[PDB]
Amino acid sequence: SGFRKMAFPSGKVEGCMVQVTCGTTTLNGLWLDDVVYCPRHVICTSEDMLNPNYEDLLIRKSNHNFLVQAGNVQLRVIGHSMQNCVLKLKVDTANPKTPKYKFVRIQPGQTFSVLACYNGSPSGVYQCAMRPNFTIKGSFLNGSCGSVGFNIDYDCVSFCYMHHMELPTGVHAGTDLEGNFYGPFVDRQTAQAAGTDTTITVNVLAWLYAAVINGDRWFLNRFTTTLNDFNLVAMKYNYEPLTQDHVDILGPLSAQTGIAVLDMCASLKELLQNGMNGRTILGSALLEDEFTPFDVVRQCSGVTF
Amino acid sequence: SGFRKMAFPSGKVEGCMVQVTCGTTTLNGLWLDDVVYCPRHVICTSEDMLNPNYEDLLIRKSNHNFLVQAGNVQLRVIGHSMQNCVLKLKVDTANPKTPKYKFVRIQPGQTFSVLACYNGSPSGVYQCAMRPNFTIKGSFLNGSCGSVGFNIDYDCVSFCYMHHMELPTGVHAGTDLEGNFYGPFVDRQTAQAAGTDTTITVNVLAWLYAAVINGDRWFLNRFTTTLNDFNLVAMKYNYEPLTQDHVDILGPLSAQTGIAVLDMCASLKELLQNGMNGRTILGSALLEDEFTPFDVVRQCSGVTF
Ligand SMILES: CN(C)CCCCNC(=O)C[C@H](Cc1ccc(F)cc1)NC(=O)[C@@H](Cc1ccc(Cl)cc1Cl)NC(=O)[C@H](N)Cc1ccccc1C#N
Numbered sequence: 313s314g315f316r317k318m319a320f321p322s323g324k325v326e327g328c329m330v331q332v333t334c335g336t337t338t339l340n341g342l343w344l345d346d347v348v349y350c351p352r353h354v355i356c357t358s359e360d361m362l363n364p365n366y367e368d369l370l371i372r373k374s375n376h377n378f379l380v381q382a383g384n385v386q387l388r389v390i391g392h393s394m395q396n397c398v399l400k401l402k403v404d405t406a407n408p409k410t411p412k413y414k415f416v417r418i419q420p421g422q423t424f425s426v427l428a429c430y431n432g433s434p435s436g437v438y439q440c441a442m443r444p445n446f447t448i449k450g451s452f453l454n455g456s457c458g459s460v461g462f463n464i465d466y467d468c469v470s471f472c473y474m475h476h477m478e479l480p481t482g483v484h485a486g487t488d489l490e491g492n493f494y495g496p497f498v499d500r501q502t503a504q505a506a507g508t509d510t511t512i513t514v515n516v517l518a519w520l521y522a523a524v525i526n527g528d529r530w531f532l533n534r535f536t537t538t539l540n541d542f543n544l545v546a547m548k549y550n551y552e553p554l555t556q557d558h559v560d561i562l563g564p565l566s567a568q569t570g571i572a573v574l575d576m577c578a579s580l581k582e583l584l585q586n587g588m589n590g591r592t593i594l595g596s597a598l599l600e601d602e603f604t605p606f607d608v609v610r611q612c613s614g615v616t617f
Numbered sequence: 618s619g620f621r622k623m624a625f626p627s628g629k630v631e632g633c634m635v636q637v638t639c640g641t642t643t644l645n646g647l648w649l650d651d652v653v654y655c656p657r658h659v660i661c662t663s664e665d666m667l668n669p670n671y672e673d674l675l676i677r678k679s680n681h682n683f684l685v686q687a688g689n690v691q692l693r694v695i696g697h698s699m700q701n702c703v704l705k706l707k708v709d710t711a712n713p714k715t716p717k718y719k720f721v722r723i724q725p726g727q728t729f730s731v732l733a734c735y736n737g738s739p740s741g742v743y744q745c746a747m748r749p750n751f752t753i754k755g756s757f758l759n760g761s762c763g764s765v766g767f768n769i770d771y772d773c774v775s776f777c778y779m780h781h782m783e784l785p786t787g788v789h790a791g792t793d794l795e796g797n798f799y800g801p802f803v804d805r806q807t808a809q810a811a812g813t814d815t816t817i818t819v820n821v822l823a824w825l826y827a828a829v830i831n832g833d834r835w836f837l838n839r840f841t842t843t844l845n846d847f848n849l850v851a852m853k854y855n856y857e858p859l860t861q862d863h864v865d866i867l868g869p870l871s872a873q874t875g876i877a878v879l880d881m882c883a884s885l886k887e888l889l890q891n892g893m894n895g896r897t898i899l900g901s902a903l904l905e906d907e908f909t910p911f912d913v914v915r916q917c918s919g920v921t922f
């Protein structure tokens with residue numbers, strides 16, 4: 313019993329974090345086999361950041377301009393290249409702790425664990441979701457750039473996020489591990505705005521199923537709704553439209569609890585229209601939307617209370 | 618910027634988790650040097666659990682009754698002993714991945730990271746606090762017994778919790794790593810009730826300072842209060858009394874934000890008496906009490922917004 317924001321065990325990723333320094337700029341890199349991946353803005357000085365020409369900046373660099381430290385051990389850089397917004401540094405040593413891994417580019421609404429690092433040293437782990445507007449509501453300070461987001465499946469680490477910057481609103485923007493930003497952002501020091509965010513409806517529904525699985529049922533009702541009528545309510549409360557694909561993805565939770573998806577939608581409709589009246593769900597006084605249906609199945613019992 | 622429930626990186630503890638089997642009972646153990654620590658109820662059968670005599674049960678066992686698996690590698694048990702509610706199994710192999718570590722018994726209100734494990738395999742990491750009634754609001758299923766709670770300080774792992782059982786209320790009870798339960802609980806299968814819980818006042822105050830550090834100031838006021846008057850309000854709302862020791866512990870956060878502790882108390886008084894009126898603090902619609910002053914300093918910037 314119980315329900316917590318749960319990250320994946322971080323050990324397989326901790327063995328991959330290194331420090332990358334280029335001049336006065338220091339940040340984190342990810343060391344896999346004999347390649348170190350890091351944000352390309354490590355090659356920028358403070359004046360370059362306003363409108364950098366990265367191709368120009370990189371051509372003026374050589375291998376010896378890049379300091380890579382794994383622990384206190386310095387790694388020799390033997391080659392460098394740029395791929396979109398990530399720098400790739402080839403090193404003379406393959407990382408002996410390289411896990412089985414993949415690079416994946418995730419969709420909005422998916423969650424991942426973040427290993428927050430400073431100066432190549434892991435400092436904490438938490439759960440994030442990719443927001444519909446392609447930002448993440450992270451916890452990051454100066455020096456955290458190059459920290460990665462990941463999921464783990466049977467000892468295979470799926471890297472999906474590399475941290476690049478904090479927006480003026482305090483939310484966070486970054487890239488897949490091939491250097492492509494999530495969302496419309498670019499890696500230069502200009503005030504950039506994300507699109508207006510929305511609530512991840514399918515995740516809220518998954519979290520309501522977690523509450524039922526755990527024995528919280530006060531918010532249920534006898535009402536059912538149609539997909540079209542529910543989505544009218546979703547629009548009104550700035551919720552993402554619920555697709556038939558989302559209904560099918562919630563199938564297993566619907567089957568374990570005996571509550572049809574459209575039945576749970578009517579409960580959510582009632583919660584949106586009337587609030588909670590001082591009650592909590594799974595210890596929260598708001599509707600939580602950073603648990604996917606997969607996250608719920610992963611954490612919750614397979615038998616309903 | 619941002620603020621998240623943040624666990625310590627779990628890698629140093631992942632390398633210590635093993636599976637311990639005794640008959641049909643399987644749970645997790647902690648392998649440090651050549652000793653495996655696990656809940657002593659692994660030696661109980663289903664009928665023994667009602668009122669076990671552990672000294673009797675252990676005398677009828679020998680080393681070969683205990684199966685220890687680290688990965689797929691079986692570990693040879695060469696000695697066994699009981700210390701309070703933990704079993705200690707001496708094995709022929711020292712764990713090559715043993716971190717620098719200490720055993721610590723924590724006070725209520727302190728937080729720790731939990732590495733939830735099943736069958737010796739880490740499955741997730743989250744943050745917990747020891748509640749004033751000596752339970753933790755964990756996320757644990759059958760098979761999670763022997764999972765540990767820990768803090769990390771400069772590569773030294775401080776183990777403070779070993780998980781033993783879930784109470785009928787769905788909260789969780791366990792021991793320090795010397796086998797002494799937190800709270801009044803005992804390791805037998807009877808319905809046990811915890812004392813009534815209270816809110817950790819000093820942590821709520823720390824979390825309010827985190828909000829100011831991050832730029833959330835709507836809940837501040839010009840009022841100040843006295844320690845005695847505030848504690849009258851604390852009693853009314855089932856909050857722990859605030860001690861002068863707690864005031865002093867919040868000193869560094871008070872100094873970074875320019876908000877005297879008793880000033881923040883008057884803000885908290887107003888929040889308790891009037892609620893939030895539909896506003897959030899650090900993305901929560903409730904007053905959060907599972908961040909210590911240390912947790913806030915660890916995660917937040919050292920300069921106030
Ligand atoms: C309303 N309130 C509640 C919300 C409080 C919100 C206050 N938040 C800020 O003031 C952050 C600030 C906002 C901003 C201001 C002007 C501008 F023109 C662009 C952005 N952002 C940066 O300073 C960017 C500038 C930058 C550098 C390189 C590139 Cl490639 C791109 C960019 Cl944009 N630095 C970074 O992100 C570092 N790499 C990492 C870092 C440094 C410092 C702090 C955190 C982090 C992280 N994580």
Ligand SMILES: CN(C)CCCCNC(=O)C[C@H](Cc1ccc(F)cc1)NC(=O)[C@@H](Cc1ccc(Cl)cc1Cl)NC(=O)[C@H](N)Cc1ccccc1C#N
Pocket residue numbers: 313526527528617658666757758759760761762781782783784785786787789803804805806807808809
């Ligand atoms: C109101 N609603 C919202 C809240 C929903 C609350 C429903 N929760 C329960 O029903 C759990 C149940 C409550 C209970 C019932 C009768 C009783 F007499 C004592 C306790 N507890 C156990 O079944 C105990 C029995 C036990 C075994 C050995 C010892 Cl030494 C001591 C004890 Cl007490 N088993 C365990 O804790 C396993 N080791 C781990 C485990 C097994 C199964 C599930 C979770 C975990 C964990 N983590």
